[PDB]
Design a protein around this ligand. Structure first.
Ligand code: ATP
Ligand code: ADP
Lengths: 179, 11, 502, 481, 72, 145, 245, 125, 145
């Protein structure tokens, strides 16, 4: 695994044991941007800064953002054991374990234009049938780097893939090179 | 190259 | 270093559940990452370094590495059935073995647990395994003999009570015949022998124990036996439990003896353990702490002063060499630790000189303080004549000054070589030793036959034991070679010579 | 043993890492089959052994087969037991790999009895303390370098001397003389040499091919084509097959190992793969324990006795290297096989002087046997020293005691030969079994002046000194005629 | 992965596509008189070897029963 | 790396006459440094292979090409790899070359020796002369017989 | 070592006394430093020693000096492991010492006690301005004949003494006389040999070696020189040997 | 070394003339790689060199070649450390050279300059 | 460590006539462990410095002081660092001295000698006695000539 994996899975498990999974997802998406914007990340980093002067402002951020208390406990323990320098990696790795526990496989559909969503729900049906995922949170990006159509990366990060915008003419080049 | 020295001495 | 062992998910979940609280896991530790002779334990906040811990399978441990979040214990056996996540319990006791007077006659497996099959051993639990050695004011100069029963040892390499005498040689060159000879010779004396078998094959331990039981030496002997199929931790720790068992008798005014068979095998086990714990090794891959490993074990063999009850412990460590390599690492370590060595030699062992003591390179730094008056007075001339033989046989193939040297070497040296050789498991009392050195080195055994020397000596031995009871009384009374014993032995050996000529 | 299903987490060479449910993971030294998938279009499973527990629901295994074509996430089946091999009379005359699978293509073996290869040795109380003499029926081995029952013996003969014929004669003799069986364990067996050995065992009658289970040997083969996990554990598989024949059947078993140096070599390979720090000359840090955990199960209990005859390779021809030095801490006897004696036709080609034994002691073999063996050694050594002088002066310009010594030595050196039951198939001579009693009674007569008026070619290639006198009378009839 | 070439134009972000094949070579009797590299492709520049079969680079050895004794 | 070399060299087989009687003869080459045969890779490939054919820079500079060291080279197949014509002369060649290797030390004192010893020495030093060959001139089996 | 050095340094500084500092096995100081430095979390040096070995030696040995107040004449035993003189710990001790004395396992096993190797044992005080010119010239000639002997030792090992020239065999005989006369009985080894220890002054040693090298004492046994002092006793022992016969 | 080799590559290829390329110690071209290799995070090879010794040497040595349009005769000096000819850096050059010229110290110690070892320095011509 | 000693030593140069013709001459001292030139740092520095001077311990004990081991010590500048008088008288001297040292080694195991051989040996021994010095007793240029 990694330190990010072993902490993210712990937070997702203590979020499963007392069902707050939507509250903890909102909490981690809040904390992702709360620990972005590098002044505050540096401040909770920079080990010269004392742990008490960290914990004071941290409990302030707890009170203002109204977070769940066990996620606040998690951040307190990240201050305690000096793994706060990897809080960005832990928070970014939390999403994969949340989707593993919540039965979701997230699958991009990178196409050129916006889709009309009936065939997009069809792609949702296909990706959820082919993987056993209960409710796929499909996302798309308007990216004109393609030629004609769409393609979908699903699985763990992007591991599996089927590509139909450019792969046709790519196979045509592979035919013409003939090697 | 000391082991070849001892090998040649033994020889 | 960005990863730890305590960073498994259950520990972090239990930390996240309640951050601030009061009661930690006091004696309840959960094992994680069972490795290779080590097991890391989250928990045990109040455990001690050196504390015994107990596993669910039943395996004993020792807390060695007490890091911030996890303690790393060393497995005192095969940690095979240690289920990952199972509980561990401290005992509150630094590593100990139960000691008693009832260990005499039992066989031990380095944990004070019998592998004898004759039931448990009653005891009163004491005697920490890593007991401290005596100080400087605690001990006393060595002054009394520990008779080994071998003519060569007792005559030229005298061992005293309280002296660390090493037995260094090659494989199958003695050292166990010598060790068991010294143990079996302790029948009359009040000496508590201890035999530690560190890496011997279990068949050799069987041979030694059945020889002991057959000849009657298990009424004062304990056997701590670690076979070659044992974990390296138990082979490492067996001589320390042997030393603790012997120290129990030592600090109660009783004289003890201990033989660490194959301390080179204990150093090899310590090497395996350090390399599996990834410590940086020195020369020949040894951990660098191997001198300390041997020195804190051998420094316990002392001769306590009169205020401390006048106990003693003699140590006969055994070290094997590779093709007679005295200048190796572990042999030089034990030589720099002990008080003298006894060199056995493969050429003389295989060539027939069966107690193969390489006398010219063996010392004992007690000497005359160890030997009694009789053996000193008789064996001075012996070591002189053998010294002369030692250069004659080497340098002179036939001789220089061929007439006097034939009166020198053939009369003294080549017959003293047959005089010193002595069968397996046959000790000699000190009266027979004094008598045999006298009959040889004075000049009386200078006209025999080279295969009839042995028969003459054994028959003269039984004759003087049968028809001269007053010589044994006057040697066992004063331990000094008076003129009366001398003269009666002279006329007795004339009697025996005229008896055996027929 | 149940639904304890693992998933592969790492594949780095033949060393795997498996992840498990949080409460149920195997112990160390526990088999686990990888329900893998061949690219060709069929499933094929791979057997591994747990070596280490790594922490968060993760162990580290070592594959007995190859790990090519394995993905991360294959289903790994915990088995709750060590490597289990078939045992009993069903494993006789057949060839096995390290997993107990047959590889001789004769068919399947019935797993009616399966013992684990990882097992503790017999207890100190269950050991036998007697010093018995294993009798091979071969004159030179029984007289000059006696074998021990429950001990180990090192073959030091190079390639080309009568080694394979010797172990086949030992198998046939332990089958015909005693009621024993044999178990050959090939550690690092070259495949073509394995096939040649199996063919010669079929031909010499050792492996009865017309009727299996009448055979006298079980073959276990850990080949060089196989990963370092198999080549290390094949000796334990062979020792388990031999230990069944000892324990259940109470036989005198003969456990043949090939080069025990390749056992040590595979051990050092798996330690280098698992990443442990090397020992002195680069061997595994668990060298002495890895060797002892094998050699301590070759003993003699109250039931039977396993006697092992292990070929020993000395790297760089020195006996102080750690693998020879730690092997020799277990050898009770030693037979060296002579290129010169194999040349001049003194088969079996055992060197009489360079072969040692710790059994050759008066207390163990009788003062008579000891004294006659020492006198034979002195005679042969004097002849070896005197060959140069006889090359210069001749037998005539010697003395009389030296001349009778030389003649008796030529007769003794030719008497150390033997026609073998298994070498008969190309030599033709009917092959003889000579017990130790006839050996010492024949050497007493050939050494004291009772049989000195005989030709040297009368003692050659006979057993049982009465046959030497009979062939002498026939060789004299050749002259009278 | 180990590169069968120079990894100069690799990008740190480019996409690696697995092929599902394990190291085969095209093999036929048309290799006699040819010199080739470790991909069984010509380096002498005399054309191309028309090979119709295929064999894996790492293929298992013949077992005990598929062998004979060396006599030739 | 032992597994590397053994997986490759064990592919050289003589098939079973029902798989087609075909064979593959492997002739690997291994370079020792300073003749250190106790090096890691040479010991591996020696343990793996059937026989060895040692070469010597001393014999090479001393004129004898190809500089085969016959006394230390082995072949575990043996005479089964020869035709029936070759064995008859091979036995005598091996015995006479062994006698020359024995008496090689006596060459400086060839004058003060027995006539049989001088014969064995001369036969040896003119049997060594027919084992010399020039590069790329391979003798057929009849020529060498 | 540091606390013994501190006790001695107080007498050197404040009492202004001439101190002796007999230390036994300053090697074990280095060895224990290595033992703790492995557990202190440091990468080891060449043979597994501590990376701070030279400085750990110098911070101890540079405090043992002779200031204007006093003088610390320290005599230190330095163990070499496995008889390896090139080991890092003795090889770093050699730079701090100014009068070495190297002992030989061969000379010890030959009964030549003390086992001081005459050619490896050097000093910085063997200079003609410090020890006079007569002592310097005799030490030079002794070392020259011992060096010639050590040179031809291998030739006389395979072949023997019978093949040397006349001057070379005279050199051999005088070198054997010298290496026998270098041994001495000690007062503290009266339990090992008997024949009590002899204190041999400086001028008596110089005269004895002048007599050996001059050619006077070429007609007397070597065993008269073994385990004696003040070469008058070697002459007396040769007389006793040829009288008792 | 690659700079000088590029300068010789141009004179061989574009100008099509016989170039003579003298190189001083190409042991230093390998020693610099072994110096930086630890800092590059690479794990060390045999006796202390980089793991890519043979490939790093081979790239440079294979760029030196007569190409049937022009030739490059390259005379290279190879420092052999500690007079150990079985050291990896010279051992990997022995395969890339045509005529090797091994220099002895036992001849320099006598004055047989040029101390070219006659029985060790072989050639393929 | 090679770079450590190289960038330290390469400062010792001879400046050109535009830079003032200043010069720094370096005399590093490397200590060997029991004649192990095969050690790391000795063989690093020997390849950096121009020449070297080898001071043996065997010659030092034999009484050859200073104990220069001429034959393995070189000067890479050569006679350009000598006055013309010393180039005239001591130009071929080191090569002939090495040849004499070889000749005197080879003459040990030769029983009978020539006359010119004996004269060469005598001259070489005369030089070997000439080349000695006491310490801090320096000869000038014309005394050396
Ligand atoms: N004094 C003796 N007299 C007769 N036989 C002896 C004597 N000493 C030893 N032996 C025999 O020699 C063999 C080896 O001796 P011993 O057991 O003393 O050595 P060892 O300790 O086994 O050597 P290692 O264990 O290192 O191989 C034993 O079997 C013993 O019978
Ligand atoms: N007792 C014997 N009688 C006759 N010939 C024998 C005897 N023992 C061995 N040989 C011959 O010597 C050769 C030895 O070969 P072998 O021992 O099988 O080689 P390896 O030791 O490589 O297996 C065999 O070919 C066999 O014919």
């Amino acid at each position: 695994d990694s330190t990010a994996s072993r902490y993210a899975s712990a937070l997702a498990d203590v979020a499963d044991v007392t069902g707050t999974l939507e509250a903890t997802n909102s909490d981690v998406e809040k904390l992702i941007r709360i620990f972005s914007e590098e002044p505050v990340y540096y401040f909770f980093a920079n080990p010269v800064i004392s742990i008490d002067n960290k914990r004071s402002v941290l409990d302030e951020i707890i009170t203002t953002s109204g977070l769940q208390p066990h996620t606040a406990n998690f951040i307190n323990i990240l201050i305690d054991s000096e793994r706060i320098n990897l809080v960005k990696e832990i928070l970014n790795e939390f999403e994969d374990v949340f989707n593993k526990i919540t039965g979701t496989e997230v699958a991009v559909v990178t196409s050129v234009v916006k889709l009309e969503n009936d065939h997009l729900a069809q792609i949702a049906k296909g990706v959820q049938k082919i993987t056993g995922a209960k409710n796929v949170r499909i996302k798309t990006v308007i990216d004109p780097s393609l030629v004609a159509g769409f393609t979908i990366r699903y699985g763990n990060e992007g591991s599996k893939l089927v590509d139909m915008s450019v792969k046709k003419q790519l196979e045509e080049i592979a035919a013409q090179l003939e090697m | 190259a000391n082991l070849r020295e001892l090998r040649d001495r033994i020889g | 270093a960005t990863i730890r062992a305590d960073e498994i998910s259950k520990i972090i979940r239990e930390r996240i559940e309640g951050y601030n609280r009061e009661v930690k896991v006091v004696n309840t530790g959960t094992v994680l990452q069972v490795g290779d002779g080590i097991a890391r334990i989250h928990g045990l906040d109040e455990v001690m370094a050196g504390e015994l811990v107990e596993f669910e399978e039943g395996t004993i441990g020792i807390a060695l590495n007490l890091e911030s979040n996890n303690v790393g214990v060393v497995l005192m056996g095969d940690g095979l059935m240690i289920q990952e996540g199972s509980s561990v319990k401290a005992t509150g006791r630094i590593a100990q073995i139960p000691v008693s007077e009832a260990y005499l006659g039992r066989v031990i497996n380095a944990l004070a647990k019998p592998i004898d099959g004759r039931g448990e051993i009653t005891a009163s639990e004491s005697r920490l395994i890593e007991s401290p050695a005596p100080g400087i004011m605690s001990r006393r100069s060595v002054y009394e003999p520990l008779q080994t029963g071998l003519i060569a040892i007792d005559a030229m390499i005298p061992v005293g009570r309280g002296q660390r005498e090493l037995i260094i040689g090659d494989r199958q060159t003695g050292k166990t015949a010598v060790a068991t000879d010294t143990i079996l010779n302790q029948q009359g004396q009040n000496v508590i022998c201890v035999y530690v078998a560190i890496g011997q094959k279990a068949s050799s331990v069987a041979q030694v124990v059945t020889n002991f039981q057959e000849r009657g030496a298990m009424e004062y002997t304990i056997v701590v036996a670690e076979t070659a199929d044992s974990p390296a931790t138990l082979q490492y720790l067996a001589p320390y439990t042997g030393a603790a068992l012997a120290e129990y008798f030592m600090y109660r005014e009783r004289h003890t003896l201990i033989i660490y068979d194959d301390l080179s095998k204990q150093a090899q086990a310590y090497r395996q353990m350090s390399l599996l714990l990834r410590r940086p090794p020195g020369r020949e891959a040894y951990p660098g702490d191997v001198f300390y490993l041997h020195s804190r074990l051998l420094e316990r063999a002392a001769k306590l002063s009169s205020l401390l009850g006048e106990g003693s412990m003699t140590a006969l460590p055994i070290v094997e060499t590779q093709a007679g390599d005295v200048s190796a690492y572990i042999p030089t370590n034990v030589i720099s630790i002990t008080d003298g060595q006894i060199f056995l030699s493969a050429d003389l062992f295989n060539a027939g000189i069966r107690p193969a003591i390489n006398v010219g390179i063996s010392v004992s730094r007690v000497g005359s303080a160890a030997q009694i008056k009789a053996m000193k007075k008789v064996a001075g001339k012996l070591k002189l004549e053998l010294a002369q033989f030692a250069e004659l046989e080497a340098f002179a193939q036939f001789a220089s000054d061929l007439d006097k040297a034939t009166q020198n070497q053939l009369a003294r040296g080549q017959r003293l070589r047959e005089l010193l050789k002595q069968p397996q498991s046959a000790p000699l009392t000190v009266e027979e030793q004094v008598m045999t050195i006298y009959t040889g080195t004075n000049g009386y055994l200078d006209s025999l036959e080279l295969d009839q020397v042995r028969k003459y000596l054994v028959e003269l031995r039984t004759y003087v034991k049968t028809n001269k009871p007053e010589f044994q009384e006057i040697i066992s009374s004063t331990k000094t070679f008076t003129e009366e014993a001398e003269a009666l032995l002279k006329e007795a050996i004339q009697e025996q010579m005229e008896r055996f000529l027929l | 043993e149940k639904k304890n299903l693992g998933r592969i987490a790492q594949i780095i060479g033949p060393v795997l890492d498996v992840a498990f449910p949080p409460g149920k993971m195997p112990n160390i030294y526990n088999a686990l089959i990888v329900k893998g998938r061949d690219t060709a279009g069929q499933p094929m499973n791979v057997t591994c052994e747990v070596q280490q527990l790594l922490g968060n629901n993760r162990v580290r295994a070592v594959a007995m087969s190859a790990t090519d074509g394995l993905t991360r996430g294959m289903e790994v089946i915990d088995t709750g037991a060590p490597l289990s091999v078939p045992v009993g009379g069903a494993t006789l005359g057949r060839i096995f790999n390290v997993l107990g699978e047959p590889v001789d293509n004769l068919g399947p073996v019935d797993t009616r009895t399966t013992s684990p290869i990882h097992r503790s040795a017999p207890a100190f109380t269950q050991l036998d303390t007697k010093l018995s003499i294993f009798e091979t029926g071969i004159k030179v081995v029984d007289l000059l370098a006696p074998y021990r029952r429950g001990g180990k013996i090192g073959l030091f003969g190079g390639a080309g001397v009568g080694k394979t014929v010797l172990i086949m004669e030992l198998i046939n003799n332990i089958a015909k003389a005693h009621g024993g069986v044999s178990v050959f364990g090939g550690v690092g067996e070259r495949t073509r040499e394995g096939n040649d050995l199996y063919m010669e065992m079929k031909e010499s009658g050792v492996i009865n091919e017309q009727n299996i289970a009448e055979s006298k040997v079980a073959l276990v083969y850990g080949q060089m084509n196989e990963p370092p996990g198999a080549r290390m554990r094949v000796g334990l598989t062979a020792l388990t097959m031999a230990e069944y024949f000892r324990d259940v059947n109470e036989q005198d078993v003969l456990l043949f190992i090939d080069n025990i140096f390749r056992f040590v070599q595979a051990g050092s390979e798996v330690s280098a793969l698992l990443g442990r720090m090397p020992s002195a000359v680069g061997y595994q840090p668990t060298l002495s324990t890895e060797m002892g955990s094998l050699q301590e199960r070759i003993t003699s209990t109250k039931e039977g006795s396993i006697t092992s005859i292990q070929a020993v390779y000395v790297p760089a021809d020195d006996l102080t290297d750690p693998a020879p030095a730690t092997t020799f801490a277990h050898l009770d006897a030693t037979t060296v096989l002579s290129r010169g004696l194999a040349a001049k036709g003194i088969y079996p080609a055992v060197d009489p002087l360079d072969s040692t034994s710790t059994m050759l002691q008066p207390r163990i073999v009788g003062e008579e046997h000891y004294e006659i063996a020492q006198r034979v050694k002195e005679t042969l050594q004097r002849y070896k020293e005197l060959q140069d002088i006889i090359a210069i002066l001749g037998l005539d310009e010697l003395s009389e005691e030296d001349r009778l010594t030389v003649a008796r030595a030529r007769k003794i050196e030719r008497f150390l030969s033997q026609p073998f039951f298994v070498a008969e198939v190309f030599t033709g001579s009917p092959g003889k079994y000579v017990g130790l009693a006839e050996t010492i009674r024949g050497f007493q007569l050939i050494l004291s002046g009772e049989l000195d008026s005989l030709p040297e070619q009368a003692f050659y290639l006979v057993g049982n000194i009465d046959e030497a006198t009979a062939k002498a009378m026939n060789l004299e009839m050749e002259s009278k005629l």
